[PDB]
């Protein structure tokens, strides 16, 4: 979005899915995986390139054919956080399964409480 100012944004999972962000060819909000490998400490890592919308920890993704869920989110930077926007790489973990690199995985809220409050466009009345 544009910068999207911080103070608390509610989201957490998706509600109804069926947003096209138009990002990728395959699902019109995905991005692809760049690496991706086991940690036998940190468990199934992916480092990503987040282009269906903005990951979140706690967020229901989709790699590939398996769905986790965001456990830690650590970004290009090295950095443990909460939240990383668009077209920025970060690693997540909690897929809790095998990770492939140059797979696509699926990760999309963003807008959706923003939208919902009416804080986005949807259409105020």
């Known amino acids: 979005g544009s910068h999207m100012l911080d103070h608390l944004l509610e989201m957490i999972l998706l509600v109804s899915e069926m947003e096209e962000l ?7 909000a995905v991005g692809t995986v760049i ?8 468990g199934p890592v992916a480092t990503l390139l987040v282009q ?7 967020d229901p993704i989709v790699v590939g054919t398996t769905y986790g869920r965001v456990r830690a989110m650590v970004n290009d930077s090295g950095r443990r956080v909460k939240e990383a926007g668009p077209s920025m790489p970060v690693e997540i973990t909690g897929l809790h399964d095998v990770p492939q690199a140059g797979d696509r995985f699926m990760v999309f ?11 986005a466009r949807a259409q105020r009345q």
């Open 52 to 58: 269906a919308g903005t990951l979140k920890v706690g």
């Open 35 to 42: 690496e991706a490998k086991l940690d036998k400490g940190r």
């Open 109 to 119: 809220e963003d807008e959706k409480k923003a939208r919902q409050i009416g804080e």
């Open 22 to 28: 138009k990002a990728n060819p395959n699902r019109r």
